[PDB]
Design a binder for this molecule. Sequence first.
Ligand SMILES: *CC(C)C(=O)NC[C@@H](NC(=O)[C@H](Cc1nc2ccc(C(C)C)cc2s1)NC(=O)CC)C1CCCCC1
Length: 356
Amino acid sequence: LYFQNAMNIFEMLRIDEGLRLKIYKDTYYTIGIGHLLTKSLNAAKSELDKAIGRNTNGVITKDEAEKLFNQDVDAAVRGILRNAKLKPVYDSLDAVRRAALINMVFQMGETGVAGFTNSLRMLQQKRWAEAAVNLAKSRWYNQTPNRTKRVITTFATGTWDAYKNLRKKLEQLYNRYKDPQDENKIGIDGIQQFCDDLALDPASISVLIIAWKFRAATQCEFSKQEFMDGMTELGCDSIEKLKAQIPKMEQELKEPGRFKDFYQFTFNFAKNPGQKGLDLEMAIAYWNLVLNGRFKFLDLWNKFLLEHHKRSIPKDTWNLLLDFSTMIADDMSNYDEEGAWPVLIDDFVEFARPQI
Ligand SMILES: *CC(C)C(=O)NC[C@@H](NC(=O)[C@H](Cc1nc2ccc(C(C)C)cc2s1)NC(=O)CC)C1CCCCC1
């Protein structure tokens, strides 16, 4: 297999599809760059363990993800070559343009790509300009505008310039924020600078919404990989582009499913690494940001905790408070004292009820 390319192709799809180092769902058990494991998590982890050759517990290194990716590329190429509608075009193409074709197969499958009869013919004919214009007129171009533009540029030029130039733009932007003491991260000063450039306070709800969209691990920490992967997945190559994405993020949060996801993410982001629970003062500070205008009893809840709890908040309790806020009547008359709520919430209702 060492004789068969594959270096630029891994980085090309890492940018376009994304690299996940933990087992996820594609809406099917997946890992790496879209690597399907099975059609049970026990069975999914078993397949991953057998493929890697160690007890991974569903977590892998980038090198392991690369090994899996190379197998998927090899399978993709075998499939393209068996396809009578794809083989002629693939055969005629140079190495860089073959990588752009494999990119399409990875996104929409063989049948999806075979549907582009007119564009594929133009490619076979080496009519780059005509093909590039024709591909930009499809739903593919509208569904994934950033990825599609990059793939079309690969077909138009036969170079890696769309990927090379995005990485340049992102590395130059990163340099403005990186820690002088540690090049591989954005420190305290950098995070403040990033928020200043966005014209936002770092403790604001807008910045918390941004952290959620970036899947950031921890408050006051921001790694280079979080910055790079975040900006690419969001289709942003500048602060101005990210700024213009904020209204869309706000709208998403009006849907309860997305709000629940953001609410639960807040707990994980706010907590200290090495600790399983969230310190009370910190939990109250983030609750004031995320439950502002959603919970009638928020202030009385804060007073109750500061006076009667005075300890850490577990994840389950954090998660259940959103359900409590949604269902609770203004007079608390519908509260079920024997209806599975955490003891802390039972204690709060008992404390709050005399105060109305
Ligand atoms: C760490 C520190 C000195 C501190 O004051 N912590 C408590 C307050 N937290 C914040 O101010 C954080 C700062 C940020 N962290 C990150 C991490 C990644 C990003 C990228 C761009 C996605 C951005 C930021 S800003 N801010 C937040 O958590 C957003 C609300 C704490 C904030 C809440 C009120 C009490 C003080």
